[PDB]
Structures are given as C-alpha cells and as structure tokens.
Amino acid sequence: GSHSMRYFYTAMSRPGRGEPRFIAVGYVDDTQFVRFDSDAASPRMAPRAPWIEQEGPEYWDRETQISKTNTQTYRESLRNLRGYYNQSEAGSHTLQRMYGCDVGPDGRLLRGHDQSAYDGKDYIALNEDLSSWTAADTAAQITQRKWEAAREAEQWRAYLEGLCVEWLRRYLENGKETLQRADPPKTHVTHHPISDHEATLRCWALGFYPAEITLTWQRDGEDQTQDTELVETRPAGDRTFQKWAAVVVPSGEEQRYTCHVQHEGLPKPLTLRWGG
C-alpha cells in the first residue's frame, strides 16, 4: 500500500513559567518512531520504535542538534507572531507545524506537505506544487515574504522530493515486519436492550493496524449514515486501534441490519450480523 512520513512540531509559550516548550514527534504511517522534548532533563531526539534504534550516533546527534536549534528559532517565531497580531506579552500561545511526504507502493513521491498553525488556526502552508505558499492573513504574508527572500520553497521541494522519501523508504525496509504488516480487525456484534421496544447493535473492530478503517451499518441494504453512532478510532496501546459503530434498532428487527467492515488487512470486506 501507500505510506507516509510526518513530523509534528509544537511550540507553546507560558509567560511567567519559563521559556516556550518545544516538542517534535515523527511518525511513519500510524507508528510514532522519534520524540524530542525541550523540557527534558537532557533534551535529545530519542527512539520510540525498535526499528529506529539501529541508527548510529551521527543520526541521533544530527536530529538532536536540529531540534535544539529549533527550540531557539521557534521561540523567536513565537515572539514574532505575537507582534504580528499586536498581542500582549501576558498570554500563552501555540505554534504548530506538520510536514512530510506521501509515497505510493513503488516508493515514488505522491505529494509533499508543510503547514503551520498559530493558536489552532491555519497560518501558512506550502502549496502542492512545492513552489509557493498560501498565507491565511496579513500576518502570514510577512512570513511568506521572509520565506520567499530566503528561497525556502526550493529547500522544501528538495527535502520533500529527496531525503524525505529516501529516509521513508529506509524506515519502511528496516521496519517492514511491522510497518508493512496490516493487522486485520477482529470483529463482532453485541446487543444491548434499551427498552421493550428498542435495542443497540454495536459492531466492534479490535486489534487492527493501520488506523484507516470503514465501519458502516446497513438496514435492508441501505446505509444508515445519519442514524449510526461512530466513535473516534482509538489506540489500544499495543500499536493497534479500536473502533465501533452503533445503531438503535426496533426489537425483533435485528436481522434487517448488517455491519460492513473494510480494512487493508482483510482479504475481502466483511459483512456481520447479530448472532442472537
């Protein structure tokens, strides 16, 4: 299947409680593999997946140096953004950035990403052509002109088309026993009476990887989109994910309802019914 690598930066100011905290985490697909935290006793980029541990000391030194430099520059960026919005020194603010590459089964670049948000609001994004930016407002226009003068887009294009996909390909091979292994959901339907007239049918998917999954209820083969309660896909803690979908059915009519499950780990899609 297709794959992605993403890094997530978060910088958080906290006036009166020290300098802004800087966090970086890296993912391949839905597997976290590195973390950096400027609040740590000895800040270093650290492994969070077994297949990255084999990288040598020059790898960990480079990622740590970049992240320590980022701690300083994202603190300056937070000061800059505060001024762009005429904001006081007393409030706490958040700067977030996420970037990375998507590749297809041949490992070729499908598209690159770099976008930033300030206090949860989209701020600036590298366009899909990897050559220009979309600035959300007149503050982000200042950043855009800075980055244009520094030739930033050309640096991003070179990373996203080059080292990003090269490192992702290496990670996929080093971690192929997990990163390239799709674990199918274990599925079942439970039944929960509400009253004499109604009951809940809940269709469960457990233990699956990656997190992408489709869970739907049909009644007489018609999708019950508006009437299905879908919880957010949630982590189990063992790399796998869980999800369920629920519908309220008239008592006695349970057999008109079917649960349909799609996942990359499944040879063929699944149709499930309440067993009784």
């Binding site: 890094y7 970086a24 890296g26 790898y59 480079r62 990622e63 140096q65 970049i66 992240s67 430099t69 980022n70 520059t73 994202y74 300056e76 960026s77 800059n80 953004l81 700067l95 950035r97 970037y99 930033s116 600036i124 950043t143 800075k146 980055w147 520094a150 930033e152 640096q155 991003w156 990373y159 080292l163 990003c164 490192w167």
Partner: peptide, 9 residues
C-alpha cells in the same frame, strides 16, 4: 529524518 533547522516565522 528531519529537515534542517527552521528559519524564523
């Protein structure tokens, strides 16, 4: 692996 250290916003 990370892109090189960022320049300021």
């Amino acid at each position: 692996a990370l892109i090189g250290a960022s320049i300021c916003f």
